Symmetry: D2
């Protein structure tokens, strides 16, 4: 298998003002002596470093891309938003919204991030690669057309899809969003559309705070083409496996995607500060295997994974490595040193059963028939 | 209310070798560009900085203490353990056990940490203060007599209790351990004893990994005098409130403690990387209120809170501040900026009810209903 | 001796946007993975930590102070400057000038820094202490009345002096500025005044860049009441000792100060990135001893040392500790672990002689008679 | 021009125990909240990042290399030194000498660093590239055969030269060492040899502390084939240009090198904490131009630049970029933002003249005038 790795060093140079985790410094929040922000470069940089020393980068098709044009961005965002973003970026940065801080030059770098997503879809649709991974920083899946949120400043995946439709005329794209937070940007943009199936697995009520969203299934033309799976906080491997088998795979089976895009955050990992789920690297490996399989049966193998969240410096690299091994069909010598340990922390039988029953009920609410994958 | 704050700057100078969170650097674990260890000074330093900026330090009785003597340490740990610890500390540090890395001078600093715990109990028992908070770094509650674990190198609380019994002859001490991990050190040391009631609230299976422990209630003379409450991962405020009201307060009521010691980690907070629970600063405020109340009723107000775990730099200070406000009866101008946000993320009604039913069953199992 | 240590934890919470040393992040300057700015809290925080663990803090008279009022600040700065500073500070920070970046809440913290300086002079003038040290962050000595420069946002020492004149009517204050950079703020404010003798020891041409200033001795009423000693880059202990003995002590002798204020940066230390001089902790000890002596003979012992620059995290604490030992008359158990090493790196005889001859010529240019200290 | 860039990500994973700048943490030296060591990865990583963002990496011949074999290392270092290094590396690290701390796995990574130097000489001697740059971390130029010093654990350049002589039979190599500290490792190894001309430009008395060395010109067969230029602290661009024109270029002219190797530290830069000199990125550009020119005239263009010291995170990348632009003949869009500022800080005319006169005298002493 030929996997394109879309990466640019410059995406790692985007940096907001001082923050303690996600809290803007000021008031009662003391400046951290080192850290600086949640959406730091280090988590993505360490993924890249581990890919290099493992020998995996040598086996991928390593690509960059031009930054997203105004044409591409305007399919989603209004000019006055671009202008506001740019002016704030040229004046040294600041706050572009609620939980949306930017640094100097962040406009240009956000454009580059969006271009990588655009290019990754283009490459896979054009037959240049079987699948692709885009290390797109800053992330995209919370961003609304006219409102930056959740450290996202462009709707990377939505911009990529709209560009893909204009260049290739793809008619059915599925977006599976396994970032631990709710993919509200993708949901809102495609909410009344049936050419895009948007599925979000997320921790119930995490971000946006208090939002579950199971009853939000899309409207009119898009009714049934948006699906939220609000998993109970504390869940791990089995919760995600059950969600995949009872909701995701049956939904993709019904939708028959010609392209699958994954909004892949790794903030469901067991040591992430920004959520409470218990995934290990093999959990992300298994989800990728399931989604790759779905792509091989419906979409001619056309799968793109776009990097979204994931805050843990120590553990994100191992989770992201697992995904890329699974996309490329290449297994490195890397051994996840937290794997066995995270196994022992998983929910007990009673808790697993309780989450399983809720997923069964949810699959029934959605009108998903428990069929088996086929071609 | 007169609250003693036991603190020494030197406790913040203990530092292990390079780690990525809890993973020792080496093999596939790249050295972090900044961070360093999990048990870093910063989390405790930022608690101290927020206490100072809030003006609350000015209302406490600020104290240090001599480091723990060999006499005190030897009540719990063997001489060969002290020697082994010391030699490794003199030779620049390294690994004293599984998840127990030390740096140069860490022996001396561990002794100082233990002395603060000793002195805090002493002060409260002697009537020098109504209650006390000991910012004891490195922490203590995982450490066995001859085995360092979980970044603990001396059993600070056990060492403090044994010293208290020798100096004051206190007969009944309750140790409430609300660090999110299991207080296995305190459990093992006091396991066959009824002069010490050890209670651990912890995330089911977190650390030690795979351990719940509800059935482990003590043995022979200590049967019934150890209680584990393994809360489901993902739980937050209500889970802890229910645990306090159905298990902890009834257990303390039955035991009639003459002194309450709290092993207070803040790693149950909603943004901690080292567990999966959802507590906010008012959760720790409420638990402290409930334990203070229990102390006022049985123990002449004698309450000591010893700092244990808590990894989140950003949020531990607010949780620790809340505790100390509650101990002192002084409310500062500090407003927790995550509070409203963490409310919205709490378990839904169905999950709350599920955890509540388990706690009811557990309280029945323990004969506390 | 009774030494007041004016300190507030909140001064350590002032933090600018991301910088690589002194370079604002953006363009070709990548965000640092840890550091964040030159004027970081850590250098001052580590001074405070070393003072604590040494037992010295227990022997000082530890004080805070109210922040500087508008009244006090307006003696130097215009209202529109205060308003501009404040607005930028309330909007999350940014760039208040050339090399003058601020963070959110920096206005309030700058006011606190200035209040510590005001209070330190007040305490010493009121007989509450023999001398004082003010750990005033952010620093002051580059700041002009209507222009922030060199990470200084208020003219701390000038604000303190003008307040001291209003409360106590002190008639002759000497400001000795041994920060390695030129004290241009103090120079410009007091330039035509003879009630304030301003003396700057600095590295020739360091900051402001290209400025030496030996011929800038004040004008009209202030002619002869400003003195610049531009020391050659590379100089260390002997260069500073010779400057003190041939220029500073004779100048103070002529001026008969009723109060001595020291603008004490430690960026002349041998490992500072922001200059090229070779001082060790005993060099700062000796300069403090000389200045304390001058204060005991003219000023009733009235000496205030205000912390200015110093970037080295490792070595500033030892230099600042040395000063405070010398102010308090208390020698701790701390042993400077770079001392012997820095001794061996000092300029050779030929270089020492070359710098000595220039200082002799300069003392003659200034019309300083080589008299001996007396009372 | 075809420039090989020898680089391996794994060299950036070497990391010693906690230090404050160069001071080992312990005693009165508090652990830094962020930093860690002087010889940190960041300075070299940021050079690599700027090369990538500039598009210059795309114009180089990017290479890695096998780590140095025992055969190669043993030409310089004894087996017992390898064993001692390795054992300390397997046991988590510690102190291999005075200013020579290592971390876990540092033995393997030091071997990799040395292999890059070996491979860079090999490539240039074999005609695979016109010149080369080796980003060899950890550095090499202070390391003696049986004594680690100055954060160097193998004598990278010496090991590379000895390997080059065995494989290619090159007879005359010049080593120009413009790291701001004295290249004592290269000086001592080649001290009685005339097949290697070792030249060190360094700050008078910086490191090793108190050493100038102008009188140390080699002995017996090597007499005249070692040259030290101890520049006065505080010197910058002109001092270095004068040293190059009056000492270095005439010496190379007399020696007729078949290969030039540069020990290129950037710690002479104007903002380095580890010395007191005032170089900007164009200074390193000019020195590289002058040495490339010398290589074109005697050595068929054969020039290798091996990365040594340089501590400034902010400014080393710009200085290293300048060198590589000059090697490759490719000028990127990068503009050095400190350049104009460092011009204004240069020594005045009187100081320049004073240093110039000393260099004239020194060139006369050496018989090069
Ligand atoms: O993973 C992310 N996106 O998928 C994320 F953006 F990083 C986030 F969503 F996790 C968040 F955006 F980081 C966050 F967690 F949602 C958040 F926005 F950072 C926050 F935690 F919700 C947050 O910012 N909380 C705050 C609460 C009060 C005041 C300021 C911030
Ligand atoms: O909070 C603590 N004490 O109250 C704690 F000991 F720090 C801990 F329990 F959080 C812990 F030590 F951090 C830990 F969780 F036990 C642990 F040690 F960090 C760990 F998570 F167990 C851990 O470090 N696990 C590892 C597993 C494999 C390899 C390295 C580390
Ligand atoms: O020590 C200081 N004051 O006494 C100092 F402010 F930190 C400084 F003066 F050293 C400085 F201000 F730090 C500085 F060194 F002068 C400086 F301003 F930071 C700088 F080094 F001069 C500087 O900022 N240089 C720059 C050059 C080009 C572009 C931006 C900044
Ligand atoms: O640049 C270097 N090599 O080219 C260097 F070796 F790193 C150094 F020379 F800069 C050095 F090693 F940093 C150093 F300068 F030699 C040194 F080791 F850092 C030091 F400055 F010598 C030093 O560390 N001195 C100490 C003195 C006393 C106690 C601890 C350290
Ligand atoms: K999601
Ligand atoms: K849809
Ligand atoms: K517990
Ligand atoms: K018990
Ligand atoms: K000065
Ligand atoms: K004047
Ligand atoms: K040299
Ligand atoms: K030689
Ligand atoms: Zn997320
Ligand atoms: Zn814990
Ligand atoms: Zn300065
Ligand atoms: Zn060097």
């Amino acid at each position: 298998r030929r996997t394109a790795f879309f990466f640019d060093e410059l995406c790692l140079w985007h940096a907001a003002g001082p923050h303690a985790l996600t809290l803007p410094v000021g008031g009662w929040v003391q400046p951290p002596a080192a850290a600086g922000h949640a959406e730091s470069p280090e988590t993505k940089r360490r993924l890249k470093s581990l890919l290099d020393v493992s020998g995996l980068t040598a086996r991928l098709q390593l690509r960059s891309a031009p930054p997203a044009s105004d044409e591409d961005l305007l399919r989603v965002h209004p000019a006055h938003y671009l202008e506001r973003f740019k002016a704030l970026s040229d004046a040294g940065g600041g706050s572009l919204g609620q939980d949306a801080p930017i640094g100097p030059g962040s406009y240009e770098i956000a454009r580059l991030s969006a271009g990588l997503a655009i290019a990754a879809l283009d490459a896979v649709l054009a037959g240049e690669a079987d699948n692709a991974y885009s290390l797109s920083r800053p992330p995209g899946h919370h961003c609304l057309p006219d409102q930056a949120m959740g450290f996202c400043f462009f709707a990377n995946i939505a911009v990529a899809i709209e560009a893909a439709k204009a260049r290739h005329g793809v008619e059915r794209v599925a977006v599976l969003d396994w970032d631990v937070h709710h993919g509200n940007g993708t949901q809102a943009i495609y909410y009344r559309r049936d050419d895009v199936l948007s599925i979000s697995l997320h921790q119930d009520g995490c971000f946006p705070p208090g939002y579950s969203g199971a009853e939000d299934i899309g409207e009119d033309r898009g009714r049934g083409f948006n699906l939220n799976v609000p998993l109970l906080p504390g869940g791990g491997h089995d919760a995600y496996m059950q969600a995949m088998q009872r909701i995701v795979l049956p939904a993709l089976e019904r939708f028959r995607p010609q392209l699958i895009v994954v909004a892949s955050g790794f903030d469901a990992n067991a040591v992430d500060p920004l959520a409470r789920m218990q995934l290990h690297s093999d959990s992300f490996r298994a989800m990728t295997a399931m989604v790759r399989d779905a792509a091989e049966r419906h979409a001619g193998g056309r799968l793109v994974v776009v990097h979204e969240g994931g805050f843990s410096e120590a553990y994100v690299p191992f989770c992201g490595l697992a995904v890329i091994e699974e996309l490329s069909g290449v297994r490195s010598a890397v051994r996840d040193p937290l794997r066995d340990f995270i196994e022992l922390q998983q929910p007990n039988a009673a808790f697993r059963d309780f989450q399983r029953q809720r997923l069964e009920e949810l699959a029934a609410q959605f009108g998903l028939c428990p069929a088996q994958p086929l071609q």
